[PDB]
Write a protein that binds this ligand. Structure first.
Ligand SMILES: Nc1ncnc2c1ncn2[C@@H]1O[C@H](COP(=O)(O)OP(=O)(O)OC[C@H]2O[C@H](O)[C@H](O)[C@@H]2O)[C@@H](O)[C@H]1O
Ligand SMILES: [Mg+2]
Ligand SMILES: [Mg+2]
Length: 346
């Protein structure tokens, strides 16, 4: 059902944040360690729920995702002023959730009720060049639950990201992540078709003059997203790719272009079984485990891979033992059901 996909989307994102935050900024993560971390969430056979109820705290990924969804519900539409002020007020209420070091400046400016233009603080970041961080993408999944057409998904993924990420290196990653969640909601089962659809959009977007200018500020590659999506096509066809090669080809970092394609690769790769991951796990669990085993920005890569996998596999593959380990999981589910009731209905 679509309700199952909405609930699974936000729960998968919560799972990625809460489980992956344990490994944040670890340059190397052992797969066995991740397996043991999630095995520790399981109660004895016969006991419902989690062995560690709400023991895994969420971070800024979830705090901002919740503010974004709460704005969409409050206004029953994207409203940039409402969402900007909700981001600022959420940061003020609970600043110690692990926010990016730079974006805090934006939140502080947006606390001013006489800030006339809520996009101006983001435009000022990094000497006016804009943030390329993955914070615009980590929170964007709600956009793809609220809006059904790809035109609207792109439009409002971009605007919602531009409240904090004015560089196209940041907001194009948010658009790519929103498009991937959108495709997963449609049940797109062919990894080739999934990639082809994303690539068509990203080549169009990265042809824009300002997108090229933003990318050239950082280095030689002018189409960071399109280049990585083509790499993903190649990687998926290899019988064996090491984690080291995956990270070398795509990244595992805080930059949106070093994390959003990686999350997409993890989802597409873990459609198939993995001999290193016990067969008892389902495909959503496999996706989260593998993504965290890549290391780096594990909380955000896992929250994005989990949003996609949750939208694709639905709540049936969200295990209660994992879900009920996450701080605020009931509120997350209520928010997902509310988005469904307001925007989707059946
Ligand atoms: N144009 C830029 N130039 C130089 N450094 C940059 C630039 N853009 C980003 N940085 C660096 O990128 C950092 C973060 O960018 P930020 O906009 O503050 O916030 P986020 O919301 O995207 O957080 C990104 C992730 O960081 C945490 O893990 C969070 O949980 C996110 O998962 C800056 O402090 C800079 O060092
Ligand atoms: Mg975080
Ligand atoms: Mg992070």
């Amino acid at each position: 059902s679509s309700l199952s996909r909405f609930r699974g989307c936000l729960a998968g994102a919560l799972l990625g944040d809460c489980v992956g935050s344990f490994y944040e900024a670890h340059d190397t993560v052992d797969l066995t360690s991740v397996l043991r971390h999630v095995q520790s969430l399981e109660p004895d056979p016969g006991t419902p729920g989690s062995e560690r109820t709400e023991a895994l705290y969420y971070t800024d990924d979830t705090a901002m995702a919740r503010a974004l969804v709460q704005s969409l519900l409050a206004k029953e539409a994207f409203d940039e002023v409402d969402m900007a002020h909700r981001f600022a007020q959420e940061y003020k209420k609970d600043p110690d959730r692990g926010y990016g070091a730079g974006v805090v400046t934006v939140f502080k400016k947006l606390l001013n009720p006489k800030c006339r233009d809520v996009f101006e603080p983001a435009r000022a970041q990094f000497n006016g060049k804009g943030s390329y961080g993955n914070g615009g993408a980590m929170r964007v999944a709600g956009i793809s639950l609220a809006y059904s057409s790809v035109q609207d998904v792109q439009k409002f993924a971009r605007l919602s990201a531009q409240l904090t990420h004015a560089s196209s290196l940041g907001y194009n990653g948010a658009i790519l992540q929103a498009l991937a969640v959108h495709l997963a909601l449609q049940g797109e089962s062919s990894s080739e078709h999934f990639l082809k659809q994303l690539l068509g959009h990203m080549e169009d977007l990265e042809g824009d003059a300002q997108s090229v200018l933003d990318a050239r500020e950082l280095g030689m590659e002018e189409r960071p997203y399109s280049s990585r999506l083509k790499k993903i096509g190649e990687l998926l066809d290899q019988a064996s790719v090491t984690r080291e090669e995956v990270v070398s080809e795509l990244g595992n970092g805080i930059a949106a272009f070093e994390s959003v394609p990686t999350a997409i690769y993890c989802f597409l790769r873990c459609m198939e079984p993995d001999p290193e991951i016990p067969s008892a796990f389902n495909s959503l669990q496999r996706t989260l485990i593998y993504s965290i085993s890549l290391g780096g920005d594990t909380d955000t890569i896992a929250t994005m891979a989990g949003a996609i996998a949750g939208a694709y596999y639905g709540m049936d593959q969200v295990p209660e033992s994992w879900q009920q380990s996450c701080e605020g999981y009931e509120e997350t589910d209520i928010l997902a059901q509310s988005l469904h009731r307001v925007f989707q209905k059946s």
